[PDB]
Design a protein around this ligand. Structure first.
Ligand SMILES: *[C@@H](O)[C@H](Cc1ccccc1)NC(=O)[C@@H](NC(=O)[C@@H](NC(=O)N[C@H](Cc1ccc(O)cc1)C(=O)O)[C@@H]1CCN=C(N)N1)C(C)C
Length: 212
């Protein structure tokens, strides 16, 4: 795998979103990986519905948090609508998949990256955008304005984001806190510290969709 990966450079990343006060990060994280793999497989970049996952993933707890892997399982088992047809409201409502016609995209499964393994995550990122979790509760992460982020932070993961690239010293992350946060909505998180958790627990729980 190469020294630099940036899926934005290959037109596989849609504009930065803002999840608002709703604990829907898990749905935003999942959708970034779907938008990525559909572009890589079909050559078309589309936006897909975070709201649909928020409403329809019965394993997750709507705006009270959820599971990127369960969201990705749902897209593999059923599918997902375009964001345009099922737009984001920042509140959990009834699952309205049936009322919005046939699904726009479908995947063939979900895979976990070997956890607590930097090389395993970089290998997956080289192939496609990956759903990752980290500790975002800390003020340092909340007030991040740019540069390579080293913390401070603990490993108490509480927030799902998407790894869309890496460099020699960092992993490139798409956050769902709008374009005003960090580097136009992105964070470069320090890698290669030798801490198996990753910086802010970045290696705790990572999933990517499978599509043939
Ligand atoms: C992002 O907007 C939200 C914010 C939030 C966090 C906690 C409570 C409310 C809102 N963050 C999340 O959705 C996070 N989700 C969780 O913390 C998640 N737990 C896990 O991801 N861990 C599981 C463990 C597990 C696996 C399978 C079953 O059946 C049970 C448990 C894992 O290791 O995969 C849950 C979601 C519901 N509430 C809490 N507290 N935790 C982030 C995605 C990590």
């Amino acid at each position: 795998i190469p020294e630099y990966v940036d899926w934005r450079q290959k037109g596989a990343v849609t504009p930065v979103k803002n999840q608002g006060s709703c604990g829907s990060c898990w749905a935003f994280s999942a959708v970034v990986t779907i938008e990525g793999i559909i572009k890589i497989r079909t050559g078309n970049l589309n936006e897909y519905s975070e709201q649909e996952l928020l409403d329809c993933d019965r394993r997750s707890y709507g705006c009270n948090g959820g599971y990127p892997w369960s969201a990705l399982q749902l897209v593999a088992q059923y599918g997902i609508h375009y964001r345009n047809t099922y737009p984001y409201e920042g509140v959990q409502r009834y699952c309205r998949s049936r009322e919005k016609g046939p699904y726009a995209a479908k995947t063939d499964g979900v895979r976990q990256v070997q956890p607590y393994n930097e090389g395993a995550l970089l290998y997956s990122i080289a192939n496609q955008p990956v759903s990752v979790v980290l500790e975002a509760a800390g003020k340092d992460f909340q007030l991040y304005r740019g540069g390579i982020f080293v913390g401070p932070c603990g490993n108490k993961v509480d927030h799902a984001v998407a790894a869309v690239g890496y460099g020699p010293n960092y992993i490139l992350i798409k956050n769902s806190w709008g374009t005003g946060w960090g580097e136009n909505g992105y964070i470069r998180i320090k890698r290669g510290t030798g801490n198996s958790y990753g910086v802010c627990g970045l290696y705790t729980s990572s999933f990517y969709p499978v599509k043939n």
